[PDB]
């Protein structure tokens, strides 16, 4: 009887035995990019973390349906487009292209589905209509459509918080009117645009059905974003939204919060000029995905020397229970610290076989090591190229 995977569920604050709704299948939605600018290393970490999650789940034999959305309806896109004097539609398209190039450069898996908000407006309107019909939504002195949070008594359960033209300050917009000159869509409530959260509620359930297995994103999306998705989807469809919630830890820069106001944001493209993708991945995945991580020259260099050590052991070679122990590490909520230390144990034994001139055994062990490392997107270079 094969060992189960256990994953931390943000909803419950605990590691739970992972149990797919349909046997052997995993439906996964991950919040994606707002396409008004280059993705930064913060996003980079989330992208890499969930790349590892999908790769590992497929490794264990799960059939994974992987969905990641593009947020191409947002005020930042409107704001940014205006500054650059271009149309919002042109800015969005431009940075969707940039996004695909950066993702390719990071060597992440492409999602099976990449829904854009611009193509799911009817689905959003349907959900909003249900919320109005259920009386969880309302207009709206100024014409906007809002969600009535005091009605949803489970509100705040994801983040475990109690009380922290709107009837109530906590209420959030579902459909906002468009300002003159702004892009807009027609609806029964006037020309305007969907709020941010209702976009992901509508796209995810429309594509994956409801409920689905796993919903992911950066920890900063937990509230209000994911919290609001739950309220919308469970009040709106009157059934459970998501079985398990995964949140990727925060990324600091030299121990300081990544902040637009501090001007310390580092784009993925800038990071890839300084480091190789495998060096970036080593740094991003060596710590536990839920813990904060600090981007710095020292921490990158450390991963670079770690990798150097890797490729030296593989260098000249021709092209097990370690696999089992690898599963046991990853099965414990993707415990990469234990998994990485296991890969280094494999390197030590590889070097042993090499020094003792047992080259066959070294080569076979290297094959397995390279296979397991693939899940982290590491050890795929030709050793000579890297060195
Ligand atoms: Zn989202």
From Swiss-Prot:
EC number assigned by the record: 6.1.1.16
MF-aspect GO terms: ATP binding; cysteine-tRNA ligase activity; zinc ion binding
Cellular compartments annotated: Cytoplasm
Catalyzed reaction equations: tRNA(Cys) + L-cysteine + ATP = L-cysteinyl-tRNA(Cys) + AMP + diphosphate
Cofactor note: Binds 1 zinc ion per subunit.
Binding residue positions for Zn(2+): 31, 200, 225, 229
Co-factor(s): Zn(2+)
Motif 'KMSKS' region, residue range(s) on this chain: 257-261
Listed HAMAP family: Cys_tRNA_synth
Protein name, entry field: Cysteine--tRNA ligase
Species per Swiss-Prot/TrEMBL record: Coxiella burnetii (strain RSA 493 / Nine Mile phase I)
Top-level taxonomy: Bacteria, Pseudomonadati, Pseudomonadota, Gammaproteobacteria, Legionellales
Gene symbol of the encoding locus: cysS
